[PDB]
Every structure is written in C-alpha cells, then in structure tokens.
Amino acid sequence: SWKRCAGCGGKIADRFLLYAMDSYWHSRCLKCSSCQAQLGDIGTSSYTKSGMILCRNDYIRLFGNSGACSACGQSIPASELVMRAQGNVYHLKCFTCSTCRNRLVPGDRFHYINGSLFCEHDRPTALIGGDVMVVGEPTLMGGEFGDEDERLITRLEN
Ligand SMILES: [Zn+2]
Ligand SMILES: [Zn+2]
Ligand SMILES: [Zn+2]
Ligand SMILES: [Zn+2]
C-alpha cells in the first residue's frame, strides 16, 4: 500500500518522496508556511512552531532573537550581521568613528568612550577611554539558537 501525503492526503506514487515530522510527503507538498519554499530541496530540515512549518530562514526571522542598533536605535533582524562593541550591537554601516566618520572594520584598532567610537587616528585625548580595542568579525544578530523546534527531513526512494 502506498503511503498518504500529510500535505495533500493523496497516495504517494512518486519514485522519490520525503519523511518528516513522522509523516510522508510528496516533496511538492512540504512547503514553508511563510515563503512556500520546497523544504526537502532547499535544505535538510524544517522547523515546527505556533502551527507553522518553516524553513530555517523564516524560523529565524519570525522566532529568532532580533536586536536593536545602539547607534541609530532601529531594530536589527536576527538574520543580519552586526558589529559588537562593549555589549552593544550595531548595523555595519553604523559602526563608525565619531570624529572622522570612517566605517570601522575587523582588525581595526579603536576606542570606545561612553558609547562614542573613535578610530585609531582619532584617539580622543581631550576626552581621555585610552584602551585600544580591536574590531571583531561580524556575527549574526540572533546568534546561536537551539534545535528544539528543528525536524530533520529524510529523502526516500519509494
Ligand atoms: Zn501531497
Ligand atoms: Zn520560508
Ligand atoms: Zn544603526
Ligand atoms: Zn576617525
């Protein structure tokens, strides 16, 4: 007897199919609730939460830890890369020298005084803060997240 698809209720006669969430699927029937991507082709897993079945990217977007830019105040989505300094997060284009306005990039030396950033050549001696810091590589805003909602997809031959 063929298996029935959890997405459409039809018998699955296809040579290749999917298993995920304890169910069988026509690959075309296992789709992201948000973006309609065919989960079994785009990646190796789905996420279940709040009645939805999501791709990784939409799971991050909808449920990942968003932040806010200390410079401009505006929210940052979990998917965006950010610069970090002194426990704050910044949009890449917000991560600038307060004096000359140069954008700071990984490996740069810089100074931080009360939320103000200064490049190596604008050490704010009058304000001084004297600690030289090194700009780190950007990281994702949402950071690492657990896999509690992740459900791997298995590609099967019938
Ligand atoms: Zn189906
Ligand atoms: Zn999606
Ligand atoms: Zn910003
Ligand atoms: Zn500068």
For residue 121, how far is its CA from the centre of ligand 4 (angstroms)?
6
**Long-range contacts formed by 41-47: CB under 8 A, 24+ apart:** 43/153, 44/152, 44/153, 45/150, 45/151, 45/152, 45/153, 46/20, 46/21, 46/150, 46/151, 46/153, 47/149, 47/150, 47/151
Å from CA of 114 to ligand 1 middle: 58
Distance 18 CA to ligand 2 centre (A): 17
**65-144 CATH fold:** Cysteine Rich Protein (2.10.110)
Alpha-carbon distances of 118 from 54, 85, 103, 130, 133, rounded to whole Å: 42, 12, 10, 11, 10
Instruction: Name the strand (E) or helix (H) holding 42.
Output: helix 39-42
Q: Which CATH number fits domain 1-64+145-158: 2.60.120.620, 2.60.40.10, 3.30.930.10, 2.10.110.10?
A: 2.10.110.10
Per domain, the residue ranges of the chain are 1-64+145-158, 65-144
Which ligand is nearest the CA of 14, by number? 1
Q: Which residues pair with 110 in a beta bridge?
A: 119, 133
- Report whether 111 contacts 132 (CB < 8 A): yes
* Strand locations in 22-128 (E): 23-25, 45-49, 52-54, 67-68, 75-76, 81-85, 88-90, 109-113, 116-119
Q: Which ligand number lies closest to the CA of residue 46?
A: 2
* Ligand at shortest distance from the CA of 9: 1
Q: Resolution of the deposited coordinates, in angstroms? A: 1.6
Q: 134, 114, 113: which is closest to 125 by C-alpha?
A: 113
Three-state secondary-structure class, residue 40: helix
Asked, colleague to colleague, whether 1-64+145-158 and 65-144 share their fold, the answer is yes
45-49 and 150-152 strand pairing: antiparallel
Burial 38-61 (b: 16+ CB within 10 A, else e): bbbebeebbbbeeebbbbbbbbbb
Reported as type and span, the H/E element at residue 17 is strand 16-20
Distance 130 CA to ligand 4 centre (A): 15
55 DSSP β-pair partners: none
User: By C-alpha distance, which of 31, 124, 149, 142 is closest to 82?
Assistant: 142
Cα–ligand 3 centroid distance for 75 (angstroms)? 8
